[PDB]
């Protein structure tokens, strides 16, 4: 479980957009620095830049 430190606007069809303060769960973080995440806040799923979030 992670919290967004910045807003992030999707740059690909596979990305997850989010706002600062959103809480996210990692679905898969085994493929690189982009993690597949699910927003606990919005219910959406997609890739996020791992340096935009912090553990909670």
């Amino acid at each position: 479980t992670f919290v967004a430190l910045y807003d992030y606007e999707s740059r690909t069809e596979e990305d997850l957009s989010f706002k600062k303060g959103e809480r996210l769960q990692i679905v898969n973080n085994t493929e690189g620095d982009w993690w597949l995440a699910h927003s606990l806040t919005t219910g959406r799923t997609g890739y996020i830049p791992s340096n935009y979030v912090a553990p909670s």
Binding site: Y6, G32, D33, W34, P49
Partner: peptide
């Protein structure tokens, strides 16, 4: 905001 990481490679 931080620079974005490179996209994942296969």
């Amino acid at each position: 905001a931080p620079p974005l990481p490179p996209r994942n490679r296969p």
